[PDB]
Symmetry: D3
């Protein structure tokens, strides 16, 4: 069984730790910020732009990542250097998660723990769905948009078949975007969609800074119901990297509470609320 | 000499403390937040809406305030109740300051200290003006706007003969507003003015929250050079209440440094900087 | 259904938010500090001294408050201006609460949620009463006093039929005051009552500052068992404004734990404990 | 029943407070730091070196401590001065705890509460043992060492029949030390033992400072699996003074979670984790 | 020259560090809390009650302390064990300081630095005296009392020939106490003295907690001008242990500013101000 | 003159800001963390591994960096895309600095300010050198080592002609390394050198965490005088990237104070001190 692991992809790293493999992690990419301790480990750079020399320097027994791990030539030279490179799935669905956990469990030597993790996860999701069903008795599902930002610019809208879409659906909202994947869209169209709430995952900014930057670069969003009712929600971007992660259930609880404010929220930083208005 | 003082108007209160009369203050209005300890004294409400019963309860020997202290009927019933009511000047000029200090010094019994205060103040201002003169050798004075907000709404623009205008001029900027006093102006006109920087004094919000609210309610400001270059500066609103206060010199140093970024700033929380852009 | 709400009275505002009406609140009075976000909304001043021009500026569809909302002439001119003014009950009893929730639920469009709120509240109270019954098996109910202070002065003692009395009773204590309402009482009498504990709700001070101010202005309290055993408890004053609020249950848990120290406390900032003694 | 208590021995003090006797404590030794408020009470010095004049000055009705309370001559002169000196047991076992609680309950007048405390404690321990049994199905008990340090020096290893040994066993680990009591051992032997994890209870240092000091003065520990896998755990030293204390159950939950990382931890500052590695 | 030093007496330790001997300090007594790092060194207990075994364990080349270091028998057994024990002076005067610095400089090997330290110190004091002279032109020296407390109790008043008296005089105040040394005095007499300000050095409490405890145990102080004008100043107690220390000059600047509020304070945590009143 | 700048190399970015060009910076590499606001700008990745698509997305008018900016192919494709790529000097000497400032000043349009910056810098250095000369009268220059770490591993020692060497020399120390550039060296040799102090610049760790990691991976350093006397100094790594930066003067003041502890330090987070010992 591999003893020295290097992990690329936030959620993958969280899973390794969750399954008890923290002491086996010798290096991680920049999107791996949870738990907090992972930030103090050697860095191999961004997952989409791995540093070959960086991973080799750690004498890794295994390198794990998803489809979004690369570039391809660097991964190839790594394999040629004797490094065991595994590719898990970043797809936004339980089938993928259950498959990733199966593998991680095996390479870690804790197949039972991996099964228990899958079980607790689905249980959390079943509970989240039941809470939503009850909440929709007094309020219909709101139309929402999830956008990925870079200091408020270069907006990418989460369309169908993305982690962002999965998160919006699982939290009880209706994704207003009908396209596939993450794609840029004119603010004009976005404003026309008039979302009840907008979820912002910014790579560089957080809280009010993220909100302010968003409005600076996309003034058209100010006339949306989302901006008017103080519903520009800031989400922890790492929640969307490397496939479905262990913190999503807590994330869904916070989002669904914001989506159905007239319902007693579920029990249990990853979601900043808006305190400003427009009228 | 009066022993129990109640003060209405932020800057007036700061002066009493500055001259050593802190132990004589038994109550203050809500705009008196400096020094921090003044927030722990009994409150008589907002200066423009004093609570008669509130001041009487403190058995004050003297009540001080400016023209903006009121309403008139309440001040009258107070005088009729035997309370000594003094009215100082809130006018934005050294002549007024020097006159206010003269009186405060006398009622406090420290005429010499009051003179020294006037002297240090003007010295600070002379130094600020010389720094600006040198700074304008490599950069011309920027056109700027100062706005008073309420959670980003109900914008009042500081025109000529206001504390806001005095502050912009003393900090080396050109007030773009040509009207008199504080008046509401359409965002359309404001955006047309295209300020290099915008100074925001919000009664309820601070930092990025203030910026975000401002943009939400006034989307048109996003296309100004101010928003584009990350120059929506947030100023401590108390710096503009009750006439010229003792903290303005430090305030001018921060503003002038932001107005002439290519000059080594002057020596020495009251000014939050912008970190977002638009491009 | 009203879309823009202005609320006067801490507890009322908390309820609107609790029922999911936060995005409909456009302004609140100074006693509305919970949740924290409410402090960033436009302010209409103190509930007992509303600013007419202040509420009108917000174009409110409805203004809610209790009997303690005023003054009367200002509320009248508001009604004459077309503003819908509703008056709920501030009375210290479940009948009033259940009636306030009924109305809020209707004007908010969530009658079921309001019913669920009433249900959870009474359940919390039933649980608090059972815990007390069990706790009184090893210790008798302590005689206590609840005082409202202003920077430690102008003390008002909570007598019968006040929110303070309701809170003392519901927390398992015996209110030593036999008068009706909130009334000033000489420290001499208060010290004679010799409370086992004293609860202080100060408008301006908190923690040790509140304790120190209390003792400075009322030296006679130092010889009470309360002062001797380090039981000058500081309570969040907003818990007593605008009728019975949603945070009282958590407040009762903290108080009852302090009142019966030999009992395992109930599950779950609003109550500062004393660490000083006298002997 | 005694009204003024002076307590020597961290855990004893915690118990007095836990049973509701906080207002009866007029003084404590330096190892009594929990709850936090106990640090603000008069100090009688270190438990092993009590200040006679220090306790007498407090006019105590009773002085409680364990075998480790002294020196003997000082305790004697105290008894001769009329002070009631009680000696409880510091022995690392439930029989001793149950006997200490029995006495404290009686002198405090809350025999029932003391019984309930014993009951909750054993219940917590039964639950901890069951969790461990389940955790050992996928992982065998790890060999561990517990050391008491002084700014990383003067290391004492917890052998058999010590609170440290009790804590390691109850948390699911195997104490690698075979000696009796706390004894100094050469780092050479300690490194040879090659612990999977090392628990450090430092009197002066905490967190990374404690780790760094430990390695500075005992370089040989760097080659242990504990140092390599980032498992130099820092434990709150007060958890080991004055017999079995009320916080141990929470302490065991944290330790056992660190000892069996592949198990979902138990529900609920006293244990700092290691983030550094060696490879 | 000695390489391993153990120091008893706050101010002595500060001097060793100030002269550059920090790396030579291997242990200190509990009153040595400055700089902050000294708290992380091995502890030898309280200066007046040194732990023989504690110092020996550190293999010290030298042990330094003042007259207040003891007890005598422990110091004797230490000398008999080969430990070099030096006794400096704790007397409240420059002659003593200059003599202590002379010795420390020699044993540390930096005679010139010690001379420079004496020079800077006296210069600081000359500047403090000149500032006071100018301040007394508009205000006469206030009568003040300095008290040493233990969680607000066991009050010792600083009389003539004490560090407390030296500090009051050097800060521009008149010590109202006419006795010699530190002695207990009835609150009745203390209140009669009616100090303009009271300086409290509490061993266990700080800030408002110290104030509250003081008033609880000495209610009579509430009617003093000091309590009425919010002038119960809390001083860092370590400033008074082990003779004249390097932080006194900064301490004098803060005190003199509080004593002459109508004077612009001198340039540059050791003095907490009072925010409560009585009227 | 270029309006949109992207900067790679910490010190270069600091200079642009220092000269007043902050509003012209639209993106920076990961080593640009000062001022703090630069962390909120879009990221182009690590300087040695720039993201082509990342810079192009910002529509930059100019890209600045040093020799260490790359890789080469990416810079080439950038030039081919019309991006103006400038290469400044990272060499550790004033000639290089003065040349970089000359260029930055010109492209920014503030040649005079750039000259003033060069002037203030050299003045700071002249003052630092004079302070050292005086300090060496009572103490000889200490032999020191500066190491660059990665979570305490992969140690690179700063030899001749490196920013690390420049910093050690300018701070009054003697670099014990005789090799050229940054090179790995066995801990055996490093320990043999027996440095009086060791300066650690860790890419991932800070403070005690950095110290602990260093000792874990390099146990041999524990027997050095540096470890024994608590002189493992942690330096802000960004101070060594992108050539000589504006914060070095403050950095030199802190280091030289640590190198000559018996000298009164110079006036004015970038240097963490060691509090642990070995003996
Ligand atoms: C906080 C500042 C710094 C950060 C964030 C940083 C980050 C990185 C990253 C992400 C890598 C790729 C992974 C790896 O190979 O380790 C790297 C490589 C490297 N870094 Fe840095 N670095 C910093 C400071 C420095 C400094 C001060 C030096 C020392 C002169 C340095 C020298 C190197 C070297 C030699 C490499 C190898 C690859 C190459 O040079 O092309 N870095 N750094
Ligand atoms: C944090 C919450 C509170 C704030 C911010 C607040 C603030 C104020 C202010 C500004 C005044 C006017 C000045 C004065 O006359 O003292 C006032 C008056 C008054 N307050 Fe409050 N108050 C609070 C809580 C309470 C509570 C809990 C009570 C007790 C039942 C109360 C009873 C009164 C009374 C009796 C007056 C006299 C005037 C009147 O009742 O119309 N207040 N308050
Ligand atoms: C932090 C400081 C300040 C606080 C706490 C404060 C608070 C208030 C409050 C509570 C009201 C009543 C509600 C309303 O009508 O909006 C009010 C009204 C008003 N305030 Fe202030 N204010 C502050 C600063 C200022 C400043 C700097 C100006 C600008 C010159 C200003 C101008 C006004 C005006 C024009 C009104 C309308 C009513 C009147 O002027 O009589 N306020 N303020
Ligand atoms: C933060 C600094 C201080 C600490 C930590 C401290 C601690 C202690 C402790 C633990 C005791 C033993 C218990 C007792 O008898 O109360 C004690 C006793 C005593 N302390 Fe201190 N002390 C400090 C400052 C002072 C100061 C400034 C004075 C005043 C001149 C002082 C005068 C005394 C006296 C008179 C005793 C009685 C026993 C004797 O003097 O031998 N202490 N102290
Ligand atoms: C935070 C808690 C603790 C504090 C504040 C503390 C403090 C002290 C002090 C001040 C001394 C005297 C100086 C010396 O000889 O080192 C001492 C001695 C000693 N301590 Fe503690 N201690 C603590 C925890 C412990 C623990 C958990 C043990 C381990 C079983 C322990 C065992 C000893 C021993 C063996 C001595 C030698 C003298 C004797 O036992 O009589 N201490 N301690
Ligand atoms: C906190 C987490 C994240 C960090 C630290 C991060 C960082 C980066 C960096 C440094 C770049 C290179 C510069 C650039 O082209 O902008 C980049 C590119 C990119 N990132 Fe991320 N990223 C994060 C999250 C995400 C998420 C959630 C998405 C959305 C699905 C995403 C999608 C992309 C895309 C599409 C690119 C373009 C290049 C490519 O895909 O190969 N990133 N990111």
């Amino acid at each position: 069984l591999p003893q020295r692991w290097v992990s690329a992809g936030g959620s993958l790293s969280e899973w390794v730790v969750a399954l008890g493999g923290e002491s086996k992690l010798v290096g991680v990419d920049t999107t791996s910020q949870h738990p907090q301790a992972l930030k103090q480990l050697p860095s191999v750079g961004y997952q989409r732009q791995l540093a070959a020399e960086g991973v080799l320097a750690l004498r890794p027994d295994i390198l794990i990542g998803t489809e979004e791990m690369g570039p391809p030539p660097v991964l190839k030279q790594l394999e040629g250097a004797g490094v065991r490179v595994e590719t898990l799935s970043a797809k936004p669905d339980l089938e993928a998660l259950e498959s990733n956990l199966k593998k991680l469990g095996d390479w870690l030597g804790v197949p039972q723990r991996a099964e228990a993790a899958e079980l607790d996860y689905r249980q959390r999701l079943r509970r989240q769905a039941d809470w939503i069903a009850a909440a929709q008795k007094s309020q219909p599902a709101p139309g929402v948009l999830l956008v990925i930002g870079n200091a408020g610019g270069q907006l990418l809208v989460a369309g169908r078949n993305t982690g962002g879409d999965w998160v919006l659906n699982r939290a009880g909202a209706r994704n207003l975007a009908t396209h596939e994947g993450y794609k840029p869209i004119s603010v004009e169209a976005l404003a026309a969609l008039d979302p009840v709430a907008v979820v912002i995952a910014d790579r560089s900014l957080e809280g009010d800074a993220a909100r302010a930057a968003l409005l600076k670069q996309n003034p058209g969003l100010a006339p949306t119901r989302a901006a008017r009712d103080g519903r520009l929600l800031v989400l922890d971007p790492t929640l969307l990297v490397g496939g479905l992660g262990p913190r999503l259930p807590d994330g869904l609880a916070a989002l669904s509470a914001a989506f159905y404010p007239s319902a007693k929220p579920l029990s249990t930083p990853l979601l900043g609320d808006d305190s400003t208005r427009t009228g």
